[PDB]
Amino acid sequence: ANQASVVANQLIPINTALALVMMRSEVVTPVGIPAEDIPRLVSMQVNRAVPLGTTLMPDMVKGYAA
């Protein structure tokens, strides 16, 4: 219900390291990576370009295991 996910605050280019300015949280459906994992996501790379407003999913971040 009120579970917030990590949503792209800007387009994030392929193979680019995640920076805090790139990640906002939002209550979106389907649920993706929980918003409390934003600290852990810093400096991990995406394996695909992520458009603005996309929910960050576990399979999109290289090295991500919850």
Side-chain angles (χ1 to χ4, degrees), residues 1 3-66:
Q3 277 57 57
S5 298
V6 183
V7 170
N9 184 234
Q10 56 179 73
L11 172 118
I12 299 164
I14 191 168
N15 300 142
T16 288
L18 294 160
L20 279 176
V21 75
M22 301 177 185
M23 294 173 281
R24 59 174 185 227
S25 66
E26 239 187 275
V27 179
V28 290
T29 316
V31 167
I33 296 176
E36 56 243 349
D37 279 3
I38 291 172
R40 303 178 58 198
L41 292 183
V42 180
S43 65
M44 286 179 78
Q45 289 187 352
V46 288
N47 62 21
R48 67 186 66 172
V50 177
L52 173 77
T54 310
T55 304
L56 258 301
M57 293 300 169
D59 59 337
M60 304 184 171
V61 186
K62 296 182 201 172
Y64 178 81

